[PDB]
Amino acid sequence: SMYIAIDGDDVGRKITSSYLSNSEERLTYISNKLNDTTKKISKMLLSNGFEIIFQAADGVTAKTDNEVNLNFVFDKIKSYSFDEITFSAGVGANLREAYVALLNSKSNGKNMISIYKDIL
Amino acid sequence: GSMYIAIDGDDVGRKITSSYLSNSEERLTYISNKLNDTTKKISKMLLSNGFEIIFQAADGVTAKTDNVNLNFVFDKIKSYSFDEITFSAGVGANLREAYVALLNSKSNGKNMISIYKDIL
Amino acid sequence: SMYIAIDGDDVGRKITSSYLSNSEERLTYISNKLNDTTKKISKMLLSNGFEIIFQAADGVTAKTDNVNLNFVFDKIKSYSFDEITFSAGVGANLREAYVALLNSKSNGKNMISIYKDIL
Amino acid sequence: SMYIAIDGDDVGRKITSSYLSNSEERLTYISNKLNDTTKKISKMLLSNGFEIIFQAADGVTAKTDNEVNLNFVFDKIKSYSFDITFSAGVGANLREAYVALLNSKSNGKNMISIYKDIL
Ligand SMILES: Nc1ncnc2c1ncn2[C@@H]1O[C@H](COP(=O)(O)CP(=O)(O)OP(=O)(O)O)[C@@H](O)[C@H]1O
Ligand SMILES: [Mg+2]
Ligand SMILES: [Mg+2]
Ligand SMILES: [Mg+2]
Ligand SMILES: [Mg+2]
Ligand SMILES: [Mg+2]
Ligand SMILES: [Mg+2]
Ligand SMILES: [Mg+2]
Ligand SMILES: [Mg+2]
């Protein structure tokens, strides 16, 4: 079993910027683009034998017992970024390891994938 | 004029992180689904009271109206609370004021609604 | 061999409240009291055979090769002031203690967690 | 009367990286180098007639009733960056300086914002 956790990089900053500048359009644009992006990632993971566990905000968590090419999967994730919003990912044997792996990515540059085993 | 309101869930990530660290896919997918259902009921209620939805993603909902009883709208929002998840609200004459009012509600306890003109 | 990661609960919220309300006195007190509390936490840990690895902000991270974890955290609970409490995480290395801290943060507040107990 | 709120940019990311990699050295270096940076920011604000209101964690908040050259003040803050930058907000009260700091934090950081210029 493989668990992967994906989350947008520094998304709250762009949302806070829209509020402070009183820009309904950019705030609405961001919200729509995020929802559309999380849909693409979720349907991409489904096409590669993943089971969607979580799909809300700017993150998507899925699992799978089939063989997967993380290089191809995360390559697709990076291809879904818009403006300067990237996505980080963490892989592990369970939910905890995937979450801890995601923390490692978002704390070492973001826009990257971290495999829990490679953190030890 | 146009009044704005920013609604956001209280300590939403803490329940989510707890699900990851405990390897509870049940509690995780539940929070994800119930969050999407709750924000849809919040916007639906807002549309029914003369509001225009500006943002409806993650655990928050932002809207504006040119027409409103805040105790009514906030009680409706607080009636949609599920499990240990409450909602805070911020109101102002623009997005910036509504945002700072939301920050006010989340810093002085939670499950409350603040009006920007009342913080000055 | 044993790492402990202590951190204050919801400190940024009480600081933000002082800003939005223009409460200089409360903000200064939070700064003073926070620095004194972390100092108290370190000396208490130094008295119990701990080596301080980290003492700044709203937390203290230390390790020990020798302890009364229950008594240690009980004084940590007592060091709370105003609306600010403290959580802690214990593990065999820095990663485990940190993950244990996040476990305490995500499961309430003013609680201590042991990494081997969350597995 | 002027208020200025200063806070380090993306400090927890380097602290989290230290925990997850079991690097007591990096965690110690970060904690020490930051405390030396805030005190350096504080001494610089003192020399310019500021009254320190808050000095804890990665933040430094002060006020002053004298005219100030913010460009020089902030350029000095940028000179204190190591490896880690600092953004700041200015205003006539704590609330305005805080909102100004939020503006700098969500518009690229490593910058200074004045409340009256954001409106
Ligand atoms: N000079 C400095 N030295 C050591 N740590 C510093 C520091 N400056 C900032 N830190 C960081 O300051 C932050 C303190 O607040 P945080 O713990 O992050 C959120 P909080 O509101 O205080 O409570 P929470 O952790 O329960 O959410 C820490 O993340 C710490 O990494
Ligand atoms: Mg994100
Ligand atoms: Mg997210
Ligand atoms: Mg929320
Ligand atoms: Mg939110
Ligand atoms: Mg804290
Ligand atoms: Mg802390
Ligand atoms: Mg900071
Ligand atoms: Mg800070």
Numbering used by the authors:
A (entry chain B): 0 to 119
B (entry chain C): -1 to 65, 67 to 119
C (entry chain D): 0 to 65, 67 to 119
D (entry chain A): 0 to 82, 84 to 119
Kindly provide excerpts from the paper associated with this entry.
Crystal structures show that OptS is a minimal CRISPR polymerase (mCpol) domain, a version of the polymerase domain found in type III CRISPR systems (Cas10). OptS constitutively synthesizes 2′,3′-c-di-AMP and other cyclic dinucleotides to hold OptE in an inactive state. During phage infection, Acb2 or similar immune evasion proteins are produced that sequester the OptS-derived signalling molecule, leading to a population of OptE that is no longer bound to cyclic dinucleotide and is free to become activated, in turn disrupting the bacterial membrane and resulting in phage defence.
We determined a 2.42 Å crystal structure of KpOptS bound to the ATP substrate analogue α,β-methyleneadenosine-5′-triphosphate (ApCpp). Our data showed four independent ligand binding sites; however, inconsistent occupancy for the ribose and adenine nucleobase led us to confidently model only one complete ApCpp and three molecules of pCpp. In the binding site, we find that the ribose from ApCpp and the α-phosphate of an adjacently bound ligand are poised for reaction within a distance of about 4–5 Å of each other. All ligands are stably bound to their respective protomers by means of divalent cations, here modelled as magnesium ions, which coordinate the triphosphate tail of the substrate. The metals are held in place as anticipated by active site aspartates D6 and D57, previously shown to be critical for complete catalytic activity. The binding pocket consists of amino acid contributions from two protomers, with the triphosphate bound to one protomer and the ribose and nucleobase positioned in an adjacent protomer, similar to what has been observed for ATP binding to Csm1 (Cas10). In the crystal structure, the adenine N-6 amino group is oriented towards an asparagine residue (N34) that is conserved between Kp and VnOptS. For the KpOptS S30N mutant, there was a nearly complete inversion of the ratio of 2′,3′-c-di-AMP relative to 3′,2′-cGAMP produced in a reaction containing only ATP and GTP.
